[PDB]
Amino acid sequence: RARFVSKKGNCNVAHKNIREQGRFLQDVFTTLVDLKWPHTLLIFTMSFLCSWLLFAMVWWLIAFAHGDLAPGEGTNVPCVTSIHSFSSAFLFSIEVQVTIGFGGRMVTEECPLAILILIVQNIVGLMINAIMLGCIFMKTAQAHRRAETLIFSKHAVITLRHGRLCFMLRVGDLRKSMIISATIHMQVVRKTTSPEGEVVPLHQVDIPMENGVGGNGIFLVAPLIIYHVIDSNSPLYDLAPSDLHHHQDLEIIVILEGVVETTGITTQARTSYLADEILWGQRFVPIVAEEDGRYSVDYSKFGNTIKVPTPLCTARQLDEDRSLL
Amino acid sequence: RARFVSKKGNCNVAHKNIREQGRFLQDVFTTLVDLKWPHTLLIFTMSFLCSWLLFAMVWWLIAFAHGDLAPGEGTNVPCVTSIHSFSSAFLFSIEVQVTIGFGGRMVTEECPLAILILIVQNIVGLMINAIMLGCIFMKTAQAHRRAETLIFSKHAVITLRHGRLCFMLRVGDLRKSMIISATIHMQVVRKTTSPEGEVVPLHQVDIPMENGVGGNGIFLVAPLIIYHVIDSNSPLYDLAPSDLHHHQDLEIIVILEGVVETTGITTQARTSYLADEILWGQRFVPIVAEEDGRYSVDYSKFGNTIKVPTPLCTARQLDEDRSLL
Amino acid sequence: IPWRACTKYLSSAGILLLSLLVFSQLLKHMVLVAIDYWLAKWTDSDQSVYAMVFTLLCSLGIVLCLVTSVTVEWTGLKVAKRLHRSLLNRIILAPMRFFETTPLGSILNRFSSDCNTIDQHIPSTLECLSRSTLLCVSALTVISYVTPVFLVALLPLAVVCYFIQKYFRVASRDLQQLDDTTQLPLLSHFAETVEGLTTIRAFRYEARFQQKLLEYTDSNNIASLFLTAANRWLEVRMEYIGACVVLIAAATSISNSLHRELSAGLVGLGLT
Amino acid sequence: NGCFVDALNVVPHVFLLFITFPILFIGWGSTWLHFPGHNLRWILTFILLFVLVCEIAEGILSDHLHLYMPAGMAFMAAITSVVYYHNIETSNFPKLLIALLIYWTLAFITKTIKFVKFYDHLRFCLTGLLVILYGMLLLVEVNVIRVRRYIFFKTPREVKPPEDLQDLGVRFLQPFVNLLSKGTYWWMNAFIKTAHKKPIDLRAIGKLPIAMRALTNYQRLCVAFDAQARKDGARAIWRALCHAFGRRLILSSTFRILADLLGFAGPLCIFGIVDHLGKNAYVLAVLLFLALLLQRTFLQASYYVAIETGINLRGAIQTKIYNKIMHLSTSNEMTAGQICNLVAIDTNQLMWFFFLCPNLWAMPVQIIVGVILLYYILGVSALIGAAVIILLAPVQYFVATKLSQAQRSTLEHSNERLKQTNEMLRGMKLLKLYAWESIFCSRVEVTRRKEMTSLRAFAVYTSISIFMNTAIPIAAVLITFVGHVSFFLSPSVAFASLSLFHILVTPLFLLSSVVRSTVKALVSVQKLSEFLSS
Ligand SMILES: Nc1ncnc2c1ncn2[C@@H]1O[C@H](COP(=O)(O)OP(=O)(O)OP(O)(O)=S)[C@@H](O)[C@H]1O
Ligand SMILES: Nc1ncnc2c1ncn2[C@@H]1O[C@H](COP(=O)(O)OP(=O)(O)OP(O)(O)=S)[C@@H](O)[C@H]1O
Fold first, then answer.
1. Domains, chain B, ranges and CATH?
2. How far apart are CA C206 and CA C215, in angstroms?
3. Atom 9 of ligand 1 has which residue's CA nearest to it?
4. Which of A77, B202, B243, C136 has CA atoms 20 to 30 A from the CA of A230?
5. Probe ligand 1: pick from A16, A19, A26, max atoms within 8 Å of CB?
């Protein structure tokens, strides 16, 4: 069946019938700073070559028009000394534009028109250099790759903790670098029909993450199983344990947000768990172990799971049995 | 015994068995912007020298191949005027690459192949210059050093405030520059066994910071003792005052987050207090004092402590005695 | 183990045979190097007188070797005799409470093995150690004399070996004892299965016991495997250095002893 | 345009050495993934190292910097290719591999141009060998992209790094390291350094890989025994072990014979050097260095592979005879002692014989090459010398046998002594209550003298062994040199003969122990078959 957002964190829902009013290009550089590296490098070299060829053509033409291009000895001084053909003119254009300044061909004080073309060439060169540096730097603050290094366990299990049904999922870090003030927004989607006859195709509802006195966020050093307790007030509380594996369509997504240390940008990661991915009545294997003088974490058992003799029943019926026991 | 996160704020837990899928290098520049200064300077000079030597070799070869390298008078004009040996060729490479443009050796309009090598040399030079500036700037927003200037008192004491047991810890600032919207996430870890027979090697739980009507964050001007009150609902409420000093293994960590003013990045600081570090029944000495026309803060008494005649008993037993008194 | 145990072991032999052994070994190794030293001058070309001197050296070598071997034999036997007699006499005059305090295994075990072990292996191993160390010192002196400069290049590398020594022993001993331990409960386990075989086949406990024996044989193999891995490590690294030294020796000999030295009889001894 | 083609060759090495440095410096500033052709890649890289040494030799002979620079650049290029492949084995990528493939293609192109321009007109052979090696490495890279994901369709279907040797705490990782360290045991540096500080124990030690357990070796051995018994004994169990342990043993044996060949080769290049200077020698010196290191490395790898096969065999037959201990009948004291000797001495004999198995195949070729080589250096006289040394090998065996006999006798006496001690160290209070202790000590000393008497003959035989050990090397040179010149000599001849004499004396001693071990192992396997089939 159709998934809401894919495991890799990319969004699945394909958009249709966007009334484009042009804002897609109106974000001129915040559009292309999104692109890949080959496309952005291609369009940067094309910017540079476009400008260089434009001014090389205009210079070729101005040297042709002054008549300094006509090879002649005396009665003149070329506006640009030692210019012969188009090739040397393009060499002059790249010599003055990108500010190497070879000086074999000298622009002279006889023609003020060449002064004007230089005084606009250089400023446009400097402006396009300034933007083509700022945008590549604004790019190198792409830290979604740091959204790649995070990992979640492939499937999530539920258990019985403290006499109440609980669901456990793992997270973890993959580098030394921490993520500041990460917060968890844990959401459930379902095609819902209201008592008013209103049917929604998809209905996001927050399920709380259960920490100390409150709080939406967590602290990530070692793999920490996130711990929620479904109660009669919770939206997930009504389902049955035998109807989840095959038929029902329930996506439980988690969105972890946080700002990486060194860049300072705020990244996040998104993952979905389907009704066929989740399973019932198990327990993860303890990862952390007291090694020689530290805590060793073994990621081989990250996705490992052991059987646990826990009663199998619906959370509504389990709450009724708790009322009975 | 083993500590969770070290006093300096660095993380202790060593990771084992990381299924490297290559994302460690896939973060190409967000990897090296983490590095120290000597390594980053080394790899930048190696980038620059690598590119320069590459193009110096190709230019040496092209001047050799055209035959302009063969010293001869007449019947030719070198593609690059006045080129003799490899040394002068490398001088030409560094002359055109890093955009000094000496112009003693002139590239000429006779050979379009030299035009091509120049028109790729310069663009690659400009791109690698752009990245090697953006990443060093993205580095100089390392404000972890500002995470260094913060300080916490070496050990934390508990007291009796308002008829209820309380724990007091100090913090403080070390510069004029403020930290915007700092928030406190105060966590306790312990090897825990659930009533379901589940044993966890380490169990982070939030203990609230007790401010006005609510709120997770604080305001740092002068050293402010953070004030929590452990109650029967709190997770720390069950321990005994004689069993903490030696045997039990309880790390209480605090994570203070906040964004520094001038850079705008969000930094944090992390510290641990062990069961052997914390002590019982004391009071800090008042730091702030009304001086001549201001408030003087003396950091000599920062870690100083005075004895206080307070009853010594367990928080559970103290709550039972409060029920009795 | 300190030099005191060996000091007492050799002082039980007496001053009569200690020097008779040591100086004879030194002289045998000196003859074994001098024969090749004279062969070096033999090479370039009084060939008959040369060959006669070679024959004289060859005879001296074998006579001295026989003398040294007989010395080691006689000394080892005398030491074993005196040590056993002294041990018996000192155990005889002990108080009764001492005998009651110490278990019988330790008192009996020393005589059972220590004596046997020493008689079987101490003389041969001591002879081999002495021959090896003196041959190594002689070879170093040869490659030093052959090349005046090669000497100064070989003292660095040898110091390297010092660092390779420590790190080896402090592990090679350790692993060794571990092997012994994993050999002891294994065999014993076997015996326990043989006697109470009917009880074990009756309880149907065969599976758990087979599991235990797989565990024990794995614990034995891991030890006997790490030991051979460590021996291979030390072997390969010492050999790499032993090849570095011959490389440097030949590289110095080809130039120094031919270009300027103009001596060919040198490079032969050094390379060999 | 020779210099032009030399420069054209220098270029691609430079390209690769320049792209390697950023990545190498990021990587320099625990799952091992292996790719097909890894071992082939490292073998070919060592062959490249060798051919590059030869090219440097040619460049020295010719000299003109630009004419021998290509070798010095390909040297660093191949070392950096090794560094790249280490960086890829440690963390997998699809891009670094393409980064290698580009360089391989360009180097192949340059070498082809060199070959053509040479054909139109020593260099020829070296250039051809380099061409073949680069082509084979190219094919390896093409295989690697064909396997998983160079560009191929979407998802690699990548392996999922092997959990056998990389999952949950294991310390002895022999099968899961770089084929260079599989030879030089570099992975032991960490273990031995940690061992220096903290005392080793079973908690500090690893656990055996799935490649070598009781279950694995037992499974292979029982499969072979099943396939042999379904076609129906001593010969049967023998052939079963043979077919079960298969490729590893012959691999060790061929490592061993190649090492023996190179060891016989060393002294000849010594001889060549000695000849050249008395009348092309630096090349021989560096070749001697290379041949020494390679020969000894192959020898050591051979030893280790044989030892590991033997340990496998011991574990296998031990758990097998324990499996047999479950089904035996009660009618079959003496059998218990025979069983526990069948595990304490018979199994150790079997395993040590399996240690020495490849030596039994490699000894004859060693002595044959030795005798034929010394004959062509010293002529007919050599033959005479070649007899004397060989004559020490049977004599040694005889000596050994005498030792054994003596040992037996001595052991008997020793045992009796222990009995006469066990009483005294138990009736301690009884003994000292009337001071009859000296009376028993006299008897104990009486036994000791008999024990001492046996030990004299044993040590006499030990002395004869040690004496022959260093006497035959002297006697060979004596009766050879005196019997060559003054009966029937450049320094090279004499010193090569000396070297060969030592290189032949070292293996000769081992043949005697090998023969004894082999006959004892044959008897022990007959015993194991008689037991295992009751
Ligand atoms: N199909 C579309 N795709 C993207 N944007 C849209 C689309 N339709 C409308 N919008 C914009 O988003 C807002 C949605 O309001 P509408 O659904 O269009 O109601 P509206 O009264 O018809 O407004 P209009 O279409 O501009 S006259 C509008 O203000 C549009 O500017
Ligand atoms: N040891 C490890 N170290 C780092 N990352 C891992 C490790 N194991 C798995 N991952 C990644 O993090 C997620 C954890 O899921 P797993 O425990 O691997 O379950 P899984 O079903 O076996 O998924 P796989 O291994 O990709 S088929 C996976 O999607 C992996 O991409």
1. 1-13+143-325 (2.60.40.1400), 14-142 (1.10.287.70)
2. 14
3. A19
4. B202
5. A19
